Amino acid sequence: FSPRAVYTSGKASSAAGLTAAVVRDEESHEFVIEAGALMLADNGVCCIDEFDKMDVRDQVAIHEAMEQQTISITKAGVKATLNARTSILAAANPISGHYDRSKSLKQNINLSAPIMSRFDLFFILVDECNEVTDYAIARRIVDLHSRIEESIDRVYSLDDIRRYLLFARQFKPKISKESEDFIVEQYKHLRQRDGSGVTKSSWRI
DNA sequence: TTTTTTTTTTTTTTTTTTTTTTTTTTTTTTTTTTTTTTTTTTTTTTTTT
């Protein structure tokens, strides 16, 4: 869907191929930067798949771009600081391949703590062995495979969404005073869900 | 003692600079030598009383 979206998998990517490389300009004394996945996705989405299997030496590059939205090159004869204003959309398998609901999120994935902290939302997709959802998923899959173009009745064209989203990204909402007060109150509630007595949460607020 | 991540570390090159090596290249004057003149110093056939 997204323009300016890169897809990448766990081990198939290097570090120079993930952030940036430098090659010599054969026409002049200049230097040309070879953009990587985290830079083609600038002001877009970098979908990293198989995130847990992605090398620690490359997790460092990912973490640098996640935490400071920039990539710095000091190679081959140039220093160049580059913009990496990507948003990361990652998928990660749990350790053992399955999510143990008896352990925290930290104990289930082998992501480094700095990486996990640079994530706004963690969506756990547990496979419940539920017969009714098995039925619903089966109907959806079999219907898609029966009526390919049909069974896709989206209220908005996907180009329409692309235009709408591009337009809306120009808006810079402000925070009202009552929104400020509501934010502090909801943050107080969110913190309170993490105290003693009640059941432990997957990760702390 | 079966599985597993950092560690090199030998091998591909590529860069890449610095240094040593390589490659390219007729024209133009001058001068001696020969063969000519040319003024001058003889010198060898002309004649008289």
PDB file of all heavy atoms in Angstrom, chain A residues 24 31 55-57, chain B residues 5-7 15-16:
ATOM      1  N   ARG A  24      32.191   5.745  -5.104  1.00  0.00           N
ATOM      2  CA  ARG A  24      32.862   6.869  -5.731  1.00  0.00           C
ATOM      3  C   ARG A  24      32.149   7.279  -7.010  1.00  0.00           C
ATOM      4  O   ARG A  24      31.676   6.438  -7.775  1.00  0.00           O
ATOM      5  CB  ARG A  24      34.322   6.493  -5.995  1.00  0.00           C
ATOM      6  CG  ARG A  24      34.482   5.328  -6.970  1.00  0.00           C
ATOM      7  CD  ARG A  24      35.936   4.923  -7.221  1.00  0.00           C
ATOM      8  NE  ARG A  24      36.696   5.943  -7.933  1.00  0.00           N
ATOM      9  CZ  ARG A  24      38.020   5.959  -8.030  1.00  0.00           C
ATOM     10  NH1 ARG A  24      38.739   4.999  -7.482  1.00  0.00           N
ATOM     11  NH2 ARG A  24      38.626   6.927  -8.697  1.00  0.00           N
ATOM     12  N   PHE A  31      31.185  12.271  -4.274  1.00  0.00           N
ATOM     13  CA  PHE A  31      30.891  10.953  -3.732  1.00  0.00           C
ATOM     14  C   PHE A  31      29.389  10.748  -3.708  1.00  0.00           C
ATOM     15  O   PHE A  31      28.637  11.654  -3.346  1.00  0.00           O
ATOM     16  CB  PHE A  31      31.480  10.795  -2.334  1.00  0.00           C
ATOM     17  CG  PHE A  31      32.906  10.318  -2.327  1.00  0.00           C
ATOM     18  CD1 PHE A  31      33.944  11.170  -1.994  1.00  0.00           C
ATOM     19  CD2 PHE A  31      33.204   8.998  -2.614  1.00  0.00           C
ATOM     20  CE1 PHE A  31      35.241  10.725  -1.981  1.00  0.00           C
ATOM     21  CE2 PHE A  31      34.500   8.551  -2.599  1.00  0.00           C
ATOM     22  CZ  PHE A  31      35.519   9.415  -2.280  1.00  0.00           C
ATOM     23  N   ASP A  55      20.453  -9.553  12.767  1.00  0.00           N
ATOM     24  CA  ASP A  55      21.740  -9.608  13.452  1.00  0.00           C
ATOM     25  C   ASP A  55      21.940  -8.435  14.402  1.00  0.00           C
ATOM     26  O   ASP A  55      21.509  -7.313  14.142  1.00  0.00           O
ATOM     27  CB  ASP A  55      22.857  -9.629  12.417  1.00  0.00           C
ATOM     28  CG  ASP A  55      24.211  -9.885  13.017  1.00  0.00           C
ATOM     29  OD1 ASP A  55      24.316 -10.021  14.252  1.00  0.00           O
ATOM     30  OD2 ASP A  55      25.186  -9.946  12.240  1.00  0.00           O
ATOM     31  N   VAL A  56      22.623  -8.713  15.514  1.00  0.00           N
ATOM     32  CA  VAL A  56      22.842  -7.700  16.544  1.00  0.00           C
ATOM     33  C   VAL A  56      23.648  -6.538  15.986  1.00  0.00           C
ATOM     34  O   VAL A  56      23.382  -5.367  16.289  1.00  0.00           O
ATOM     35  CB  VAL A  56      23.531  -8.328  17.765  1.00  0.00           C
ATOM     36  CG1 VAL A  56      23.490  -7.375  18.928  1.00  0.00           C
ATOM     37  CG2 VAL A  56      22.865  -9.636  18.125  1.00  0.00           C
ATOM     38  N   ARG A  57      24.639  -6.840  15.162  1.00  0.00           N
ATOM     39  CA  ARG A  57      25.396  -5.795  14.492  1.00  0.00           C
ATOM     40  C   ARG A  57      24.515  -4.957  13.577  1.00  0.00           C
ATOM     41  O   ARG A  57      24.835  -3.798  13.303  1.00  0.00           O
ATOM     42  CB  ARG A  57      26.536  -6.446  13.723  1.00  0.00           C
ATOM     43  CG  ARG A  57      27.435  -5.541  12.932  1.00  0.00           C
ATOM     44  CD  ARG A  57      28.768  -6.226  12.614  1.00  0.00           C
ATOM     45  NE  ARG A  57      29.243  -7.121  13.674  1.00  0.00           N
ATOM     46  CZ  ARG A  57      28.971  -8.422  13.764  1.00  0.00           C
ATOM     47  NH1 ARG A  57      28.207  -9.014  12.855  1.00  0.00           N
ATOM     48  NH2 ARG A  57      29.457  -9.127  14.774  1.00  0.00           N
TER      49      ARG A  57
ATOM     50  P    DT B   5      24.115 -19.254  18.324  1.00  0.00           P
ATOM     51  OP1  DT B   5      24.514 -19.206  16.901  1.00  0.00           O
ATOM     52  OP2  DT B   5      25.128 -19.511  19.373  1.00  0.00           O
ATOM     53  O5'  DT B   5      23.357 -17.887  18.670  1.00  0.00           O
ATOM     54  C5'  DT B   5      23.819 -16.657  18.100  1.00  0.00           C
ATOM     55  C4'  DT B   5      24.940 -16.043  18.931  1.00  0.00           C
ATOM     56  O4'  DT B   5      26.021 -16.998  19.090  1.00  0.00           O
ATOM     57  C3'  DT B   5      25.592 -14.818  18.318  1.00  0.00           C
ATOM     58  O3'  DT B   5      26.121 -14.004  19.340  1.00  0.00           O
ATOM     59  C2'  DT B   5      26.697 -15.438  17.480  1.00  0.00           C
ATOM     60  C1'  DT B   5      27.171 -16.542  18.404  1.00  0.00           C
ATOM     61  N1   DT B   5      27.806 -17.738  17.665  1.00  0.00           N
ATOM     62  C2   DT B   5      28.862 -18.415  18.259  1.00  0.00           C
ATOM     63  O2   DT B   5      29.332 -18.119  19.358  1.00  0.00           O
ATOM     64  N3   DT B   5      29.351 -19.462  17.515  1.00  0.00           N
ATOM     65  C4   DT B   5      28.923 -19.891  16.285  1.00  0.00           C
ATOM     66  O4   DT B   5      29.467 -20.860  15.756  1.00  0.00           O
ATOM     67  C5   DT B   5      27.831 -19.131  15.712  1.00  0.00           C
ATOM     68  C7   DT B   5      27.298 -19.524  14.372  1.00  0.00           C
ATOM     69  C6   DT B   5      27.338 -18.100  16.422  1.00  0.00           C
ATOM     70  P    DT B   6      26.709 -12.559  18.988  1.00  0.00           P
ATOM     71  OP1  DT B   6      26.254 -11.610  20.036  1.00  0.00           O
ATOM     72  OP2  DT B   6      26.411 -12.276  17.561  1.00  0.00           O
ATOM     73  O5'  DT B   6      28.281 -12.764  19.140  1.00  0.00           O
ATOM     74  C5'  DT B   6      29.162 -11.637  19.300  1.00  0.00           C
ATOM     75  C4'  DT B   6      30.541 -12.105  19.706  1.00  0.00           C
ATOM     76  O4'  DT B   6      30.729 -13.476  19.282  1.00  0.00           O
ATOM     77  C3'  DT B   6      31.691 -11.315  19.083  1.00  0.00           C
ATOM     78  O3'  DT B   6      32.788 -11.229  19.998  1.00  0.00           O
ATOM     79  C2'  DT B   6      32.066 -12.149  17.873  1.00  0.00           C
ATOM     80  C1'  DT B   6      31.807 -13.564  18.360  1.00  0.00           C
ATOM     81  N1   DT B   6      31.414 -14.505  17.297  1.00  0.00           N
ATOM     82  C2   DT B   6      32.163 -15.646  17.127  1.00  0.00           C
ATOM     83  O2   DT B   6      33.136 -15.914  17.814  1.00  0.00           O
ATOM     84  N3   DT B   6      31.731 -16.469  16.117  1.00  0.00           N
ATOM     85  C4   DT B   6      30.649 -16.268  15.281  1.00  0.00           C
ATOM     86  O4   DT B   6      30.381 -17.097  14.416  1.00  0.00           O
ATOM     87  C5   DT B   6      29.907 -15.049  15.516  1.00  0.00           C
ATOM     88  C7   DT B   6      28.719 -14.746  14.659  1.00  0.00           C
ATOM     89  C6   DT B   6      30.322 -14.241  16.500  1.00  0.00           C
ATOM     90  P    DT B   7      33.862 -10.053  19.850  1.00  0.00           P
ATOM     91  OP1  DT B   7      34.285  -9.642  21.213  1.00  0.00           O
ATOM     92  OP2  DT B   7      33.309  -9.041  18.916  1.00  0.00           O
ATOM     93  O5'  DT B   7      35.091 -10.777  19.141  1.00  0.00           O
ATOM     94  C5'  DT B   7      35.579 -12.044  19.622  1.00  0.00           C
ATOM     95  C4'  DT B   7      36.353 -12.756  18.536  1.00  0.00           C
ATOM     96  O4'  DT B   7      35.491 -13.696  17.868  1.00  0.00           O
ATOM     97  C3'  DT B   7      36.886 -11.852  17.427  1.00  0.00           C
ATOM     98  O3'  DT B   7      38.225 -11.444  17.721  1.00  0.00           O
ATOM     99  C2'  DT B   7      36.857 -12.739  16.190  1.00  0.00           C
ATOM    100  C1'  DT B   7      36.027 -13.961  16.584  1.00  0.00           C
ATOM    101  N1   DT B   7      34.905 -14.252  15.676  1.00  0.00           N
ATOM    102  C2   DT B   7      34.941 -15.426  14.959  1.00  0.00           C
ATOM    103  O2   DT B   7      35.845 -16.217  15.047  1.00  0.00           O
ATOM    104  N3   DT B   7      33.870 -15.634  14.132  1.00  0.00           N
ATOM    105  C4   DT B   7      32.777 -14.786  13.965  1.00  0.00           C
ATOM    106  O4   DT B   7      31.871 -15.082  13.189  1.00  0.00           O
ATOM    107  C5   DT B   7      32.810 -13.572  14.749  1.00  0.00           C
ATOM    108  C7   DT B   7      31.679 -12.600  14.628  1.00  0.00           C
ATOM    109  C6   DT B   7      33.857 -13.369  15.554  1.00  0.00           C
ATOM    110  P    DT B  15      37.809   0.249  -7.788  1.00  0.00           P
ATOM    111  OP1  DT B  15      36.576   0.921  -8.237  1.00  0.00           O
ATOM    112  OP2  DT B  15      38.869  -0.018  -8.779  1.00  0.00           O
ATOM    113  O5'  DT B  15      38.487   1.071  -6.593  1.00  0.00           O
ATOM    114  C5'  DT B  15      37.702   1.502  -5.500  1.00  0.00           C
ATOM    115  C4'  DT B  15      38.560   2.164  -4.434  1.00  0.00           C
ATOM    116  O4'  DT B  15      39.413   1.175  -3.794  1.00  0.00           O
ATOM    117  C3'  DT B  15      39.495   3.255  -4.939  1.00  0.00           C
ATOM    118  O3'  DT B  15      39.558   4.307  -3.989  1.00  0.00           O
ATOM    119  C2'  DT B  15      40.823   2.527  -5.037  1.00  0.00           C
ATOM    120  C1'  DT B  15      40.745   1.630  -3.817  1.00  0.00           C
ATOM    121  N1   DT B  15      41.698   0.397  -3.845  1.00  0.00           N
ATOM    122  C2   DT B  15      42.756   0.333  -2.949  1.00  0.00           C
ATOM    123  O2   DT B  15      43.004   1.211  -2.121  1.00  0.00           O
ATOM    124  N3   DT B  15      43.518  -0.804  -3.057  1.00  0.00           N
ATOM    125  C4   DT B  15      43.353  -1.848  -3.930  1.00  0.00           C
ATOM    126  O4   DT B  15      44.124  -2.805  -3.886  1.00  0.00           O
ATOM    127  C5   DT B  15      42.242  -1.712  -4.852  1.00  0.00           C
ATOM    128  C7   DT B  15      41.985  -2.799  -5.843  1.00  0.00           C
ATOM    129  C6   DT B  15      41.484  -0.604  -4.766  1.00  0.00           C
ATOM    130  P    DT B  16      39.773   5.829  -4.464  1.00  0.00           P
ATOM    131  OP1  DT B  16      38.463   6.510  -4.408  1.00  0.00           O
ATOM    132  OP2  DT B  16      40.547   5.818  -5.722  1.00  0.00           O
ATOM    133  O5'  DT B  16      40.693   6.448  -3.321  1.00  0.00           O
ATOM    134  C5'  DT B  16      41.398   5.581  -2.442  1.00  0.00           C
ATOM    135  C4'  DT B  16      42.868   5.566  -2.786  1.00  0.00           C
ATOM    136  O4'  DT B  16      43.311   4.203  -3.021  1.00  0.00           O
ATOM    137  C3'  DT B  16      43.227   6.341  -4.056  1.00  0.00           C
ATOM    138  O3'  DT B  16      44.240   7.270  -3.774  1.00  0.00           O
ATOM    139  C2'  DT B  16      43.714   5.244  -5.009  1.00  0.00           C
ATOM    140  C1'  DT B  16      44.287   4.268  -4.013  1.00  0.00           C
ATOM    141  N1   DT B  16      44.593   2.870  -4.579  1.00  0.00           N
ATOM    142  C2   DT B  16      45.675   2.170  -4.063  1.00  0.00           C
ATOM    143  O2   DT B  16      46.396   2.596  -3.160  1.00  0.00           O
ATOM    144  N3   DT B  16      45.882   0.942  -4.646  1.00  0.00           N
ATOM    145  C4   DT B  16      45.160   0.357  -5.654  1.00  0.00           C
ATOM    146  O4   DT B  16      45.475  -0.762  -6.055  1.00  0.00           O
ATOM    147  C5   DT B  16      44.056   1.147  -6.161  1.00  0.00           C
ATOM    148  C7   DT B  16      43.212   0.592  -7.262  1.00  0.00           C
ATOM    149  C6   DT B  16      43.835   2.353  -5.608  1.00  0.00           C
TER     150       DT B  16
END
